[PDB]
Design a protein around this ligand. Structure first.
Ligand SMILES: CNC[C@@H]1OCCc2ccsc21
Lengths: 338, 233, 232, 58, 268
């Protein structure tokens, strides 16, 4: 009937958890105590980009380190110029309930999708001075919650129908599909080598995916609530998560463990975005109480605050070279910090 | 993308005639419409410049009180006006495009041009090195261009262009802003510079490369041109 | 802004700003509505009367030179607790119920209780619709009763404020207003003077639903502004 | 029952996930300090940059 | 004197209160990015008017009545009186347009943001700022208020040192009308119908009482005395008239408080 399944369940549970607990010799705090911290840091607003009507949900830095893109509920994609505070392109959507956007590493395409079960592709470089749609992806059941680029031809999308899917832009059909999540998944973080990527869902569990074989590898658990922001360590061996219970955690791939947890008593709202710095020392995580925060990754301590947004923070980006940090919010202004 | 203009010919001195340029196959409303003029036997030179939204209209020092350019954004057609033609009104008129934003490549597509014949300061001056050089199909070629003043700007950008009109063909674009390659020209072409003297270096060579090569500056409003360096087999 | 190129850059970035101004001017003069319901409820016919695995649908109706945009969510997952955050700026919610079934109404009551009390759905007034009333009449003149599933119907009396328009049968009106009050009890226990409930009695073909929506929206905006300007 | 298909795949996935090696916290921690100490020099955000160097001045 | 020192104390308190109350509003609504709604621009414009009045014209007429004599030239008298007229008329016009904005908000709720946009507010500020200058300069510098009353003006007031403005039989009535009767009627009518609309809705309203009480206790005596004095035969002691001008002034002092500190949405 059903007695066979649970027996194997606790069998595997006790087979894995004992080894996982035994591998944990000591916490990172003991080692990191000796390192001199960095102390107190000032960050100041250096620009303020204005022009969006409604709230803002996404942004993505370019490889050029000078261009960036953002999407809004009024149905707009706008491509800025971070140096001279200019606008380059203004793209109108078809479905106004957009939730994510991406900028191609080669700087040739952008993709967006949301509460229409479709991810679109816009071609920035053509012979006619326009930006047009070129490949519109249908096949998902739920809303799109994340999307990332591998190259000019392979794109990874995350959807509300509990399945991740690797696509092929040239033909428009999937080449792989990932299953294993009970609840709808919210975000995915690529690897620096573009051969693996982690995933997060509303199930308080994070998994590891391998593109080439299309099969899962590991499962990470420990959060008390759902996960709505994940970011991958620059080294290529760790990642950090963001939950709705005022908690951010650090995880290790090879060790299969849970590292320091970044929480404070005076915080009640839920994290919305997480990002690192070029050297991995700083973690920048915006919060629903109108304020971003910055932490010391090694010591798990607050070092200064970046206030100045009137409403919720929804997106957060750090340049490739570490020059500047851009923050977006529901009050429709992006503030650059340097 | 195809641009076509019609009209022109033989007129008696002092007349005024209207030239129209018709554009099809692209979003004309978002492009500038420079008028670069080529003398019947000499190098290129400016005639006018209207921006995309008809905001700014520069004119040429030689002709400013007689030449007016107008555009018809709905019908998508470009116009030129002249007054009291002199003997100099014999040169060649071409329809050029351009587009300005971060990372753009101005001066992309040129028209076929129209022919008109008339019966009987502090400008940055640039001069090209030679006028004719014999070449071998497979050797390495180099051309040099000189500018009176430094072209590099405070924002770290050098405004130099290499066009290379081919015989019997309208001009083209190879290298834009010193060290950047144009839209799918053969990769053998390249460019290098220092700030005042510049060199165009072709690695291999083919029968197509024959023609005349030009120099152009874009640091400050007036757009001066080089003389030309013909290559013969 | 020294070289001519940067001048053309700022000119382009100004043209874009003018286009955004026009878009904002159009965006300001339009009201967005969210339509919710179940499968058995005739919300599939309300949209047709007003008028591919897609995820959302849009329909447009104009009354007295005011534009209303109502978004009906199509093929989505059952759980809505995650995509409901995008809708905390709309004017009102048009809830729909089929009051003929008498047994699959506890689910509707729980759904209303969940929607009304959502933390992101505060400050949003809800317009309640009671659909397919002729079926209730055609099911109640034969007697399948409501006492089978709702025992407390036996101690219910028609309130004095009731105004039965048809007058076909007192029991019809008693049961109708019983269901109305049963739905209305949910909103009264909370809401603390920030948002309301506007019940109605609708059937299949009712060519007055647009006017009801218009009047309810007008009476929501007026209350909001009066609250803002310290007059309530 | 008809849920035998869903039942097994969890078992094979659990068997697969068990077959992964462990390196404990010695290699896990030490790599992070090595990387951060090596690359802390060029970090622009961590150490304030000269006003002439950064491009978002004034 | 003790009386003079006390009067100077009240006058200086009024000037300081006016300047600080207007500066707070100006700086706050100028800097803050979210507080950029068009009605806030109307409030900003009125605040600038009031600050200019409090910095320019309050001290002159402060000095100008304590010793009961004018210590400046004859050319200065015309400029001050005319600028005083301009600034007071501008303040009253700003109050009148704030009241319609309120009426357009409540009486027509669906088409509020479609019609009260920032182009209309710019037109409102331009009309508020332009016409008072026109009719004030035209009446004062091009002498039309002294027409017909030159004899008494030359005889009694101009013989001694004084800078008291003078109004003829028709000039006083025209000033009374154009500066008090139209805006007063507009505000009364508007803040009166909203009362019935919000008494019925709460069936299924004293703040406007305050917003009318100040405007009518603090200008009615002035303008009534101004329009009635020529008919009586010039019997009003000027010592009273000093207390009148100061009414409006006191109005200039208290006006930004009512429209800024009363509302919670600006208080934070
Ligand atoms: C604040 N003083 C008001 C000013 O005093 C001179 C006469 C007059 C007429 C309109 S307002 C005015």
């Amino acid at each position: 009937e059903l007695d066979q399944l649970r027996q194997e369940a606790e069998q595997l549970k006790n087979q894995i958890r004992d080894a996982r607990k035994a591998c944990a010799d000591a916490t990172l705090s003991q080692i990191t105590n000796n390192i001199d911290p960095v102390g107190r840091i000032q960050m100041r607003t250096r620009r303020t980009l204005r022009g969006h009507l409604a709230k803002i949900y996404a942004m993505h830095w370019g490889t050029d380190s000078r261009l960036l893109v953002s999407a809004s509920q009024d149905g707009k994609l706008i491509i800025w110029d971070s140096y001279t505070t200019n606008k380059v392109h203004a793209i109108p959507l078809r479905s106004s309930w957009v939730m994510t956007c991406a900028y191609a590493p080669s700087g040739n395409y952008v993709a967006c999708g949301g509460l229409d079960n479709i991810c679109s592709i816009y071609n920035l470089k053509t012979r006619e001075g326009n930006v047009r749609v070129s490949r519109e992806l249908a096949g998902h059941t739920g809303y799109l919650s994340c999307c990332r680029f591998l190259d000019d031809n392979q794109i990874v999308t995350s959807s509300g129908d509990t399945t991740c899917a690797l696509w092929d832009i040239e033909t428009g059909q999937q080449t792989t599909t990932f299953t294993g999540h009970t609840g709808d998944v919210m975000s995915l973080s690529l690897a620096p080598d573009t051969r693996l990527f982690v995933s997060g869902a509303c199930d308080a569990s994070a998994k590891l995916w391998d593109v080439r074989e299309g099969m899962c590898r590991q499962t990470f658990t420990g959060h008390e609530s759902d996960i709505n922001a994940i970011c991958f360590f620059p080294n290529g061996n760790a990642f950090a998560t963001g939950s709705d219970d005022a908690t951010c955690r650090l995880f290790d791939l090879r060790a299969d463990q849970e590292l320091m947890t970044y929480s404070h008593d005076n915080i009640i709202c839920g994290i919305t975005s997480v990002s690192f710095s070029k050297s991995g020392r700083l973690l920048l995580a915006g919060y629903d109480d109108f304020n971003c925060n910055v932490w010391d990754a090694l010591k798990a301590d607050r070092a200064g605050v970046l206030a100045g947004h009137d409403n919720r923070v929804s997106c957060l980006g750090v340049t490739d070279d570490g020059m500047a940090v851009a923050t977006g919010s529901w009050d429709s202004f992006l503030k650059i910090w340097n | 993308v195809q641009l076509v203009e019609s009209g022109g010919g033989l007129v008696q001195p002092g007349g005024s005639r209207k030239l129209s340029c018709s554009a099809s196959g692209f979003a004309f409303s978002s492009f500038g419409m420079h008028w670069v003029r080529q003398a019947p036997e000499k190098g290129l030179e400016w005639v006018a410049y209207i921006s995309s939204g008809s905001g700014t209209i520069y004119y040429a020092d030689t002709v400013k009180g007689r030449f007016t350019i107008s555009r018809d954004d709905p019908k998508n057609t470009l116009f030129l006006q002249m007054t009291s033609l002199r003997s100099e009104d014999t040169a060649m008129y071409y329809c050029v495009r351009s587009i300005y934003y971060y990372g753009s490549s101005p001066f992309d597509f040129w028209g076929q041009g129209t022919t008109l014949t008339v019966s009987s300061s502090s400008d940055i001056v640039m001069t090209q090195a030679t006028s004719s050089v014999p070449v071998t199909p497979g050797e390495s070629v180099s051309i040099s261009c000189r500018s009176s003043k430094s072209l590099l700007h405070s924002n770290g950008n050098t405004y130099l262009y290499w066009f290379l009109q081919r015989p019997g063909q309208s001009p083209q674009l190879l290298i834009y802003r010193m060290s950047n390659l144009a839209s799918g020209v053969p990769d053998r072409f390249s460019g290098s510079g220092s700030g005042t003297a510049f060199t165009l270096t072709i690695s291999r060579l083919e029968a197509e490369d024959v023609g005349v090569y030009y120099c152009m500056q874009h640091l400050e409003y007036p757009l001066t041109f080089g003389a030309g360096t013909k290559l013969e087999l | 802004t020294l070289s001519a190129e940067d001048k053309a850059a700022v000119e382009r970035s100004k043209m874009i700003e003018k286009q955004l101004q026009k878009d904002k001017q159009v965006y300001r003069a339009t009201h967005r509505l969210l339509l919710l319901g179940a499968d058995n409820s005739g919300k599939s016919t309300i949209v047709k009367q007003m008028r591919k695995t897609s995820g959302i649908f849009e329909t447009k109706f104009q009354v007295d030179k005011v534009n209303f945009h109502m978004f009906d969510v199509g093929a989505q997952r059952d759980e809505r607790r995650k995509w409901i955050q995008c809708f905390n700026d709309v004017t009102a919610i048009i809830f729909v119920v089929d009051s003929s079934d008498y047994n699959r109404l506890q689910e509707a009551l729980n759904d209303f209780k969940s929607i009304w009390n959502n933390r992101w759905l505060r400050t949003i007034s809800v317009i309640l619709f009671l659909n397919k009333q002729d079926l209730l009449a055609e099911k109640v003149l034969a007697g399948s009763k409501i006492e089978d599933y709702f025992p407390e119907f036996a101690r219910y009396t028609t309130p004095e404020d009731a105004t039965p328009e048809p007058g076909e049968d007192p029991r019809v009106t008693r049961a109708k207003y019983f269901i109305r009050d049963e739905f209305l009890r949910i909103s009264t226990a909370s809401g603390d003077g920030r948002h309301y409930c506007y019940p109605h009695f609708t059937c299949s073909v009712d060519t007055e639903n647009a006017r009801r929506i218009f009047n309810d929206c007008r009476d929501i905006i007026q209350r909001m502004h009066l609250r803002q300007y310290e007059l309530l | 029952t008809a849920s035998i298909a869903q039942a097994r795949k969890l078992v094979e996935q659990l068997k697969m996930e068990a077959n992964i090696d462990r390196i404990k916290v010695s290699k896990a921690a030490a790599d992070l300090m090595a990387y951060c100490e090596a690359h802390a020099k060029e970090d622009p955000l961590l150490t304030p940059v000269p006003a002439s160097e950064n491009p978002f001045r004034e | 004197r003790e009386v003079q020192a006390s009067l100077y104390s009240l006058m200086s308190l009024i000037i300081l209160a006016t300047l600080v109350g207007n500066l707070i509003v100006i700086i706050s609504i100028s800097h803050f990015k979210q507080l950029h709604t068009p009605t806030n621009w109307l409030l900003h414009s009125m605040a600038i008017v009031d600050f200019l009045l409090g910095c320019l014209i309050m001290p002159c007429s402060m000095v100008r009545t304590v010793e009961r004599c004018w210590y400046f030239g004859e050319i200065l008298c015309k400029v001050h009186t005319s600028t005083d007229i301009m600034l007071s008329s501008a303040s009253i016009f700003h109050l009148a347009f704030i009241s319609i904005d309120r009426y357009c908000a409540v009486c027509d709720p669906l088409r509020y943001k479609a019609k009260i946009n920032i182009s209309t507010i710019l037109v409102m500020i331009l009309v508020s700022w332009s016409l008072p200058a026109v009719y004030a300069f035209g009446m004062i510098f091009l002498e039309l208020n002294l027409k017909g009353v030159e004899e008494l003006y030359r005889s009694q007031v101009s013989d001694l040192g004084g800078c008291s403005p003078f109004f003829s039989k028709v000039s006083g009535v025209l000033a009374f009308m154009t500066s008090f009767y139209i805006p007063g009627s507009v505000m009364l009518f508007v803040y009166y119908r909203i009362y019935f609309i919000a008494k019925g809705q709460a069936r299924s309203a004293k703040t406007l009482g305050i917003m009318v009480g100040v405007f009518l206790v603090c200008w009615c005596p002035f303008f009534l005395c101004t329009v009635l004095d020529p008919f009586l035969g010039y019997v009003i002691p000027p010592s009273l008239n000093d207390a009148l001008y100061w009414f409006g002034y006191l109005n200039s002092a208290l006006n930004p408080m009512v429209y800024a500190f009363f509302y919670p949405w600006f208080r934070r």
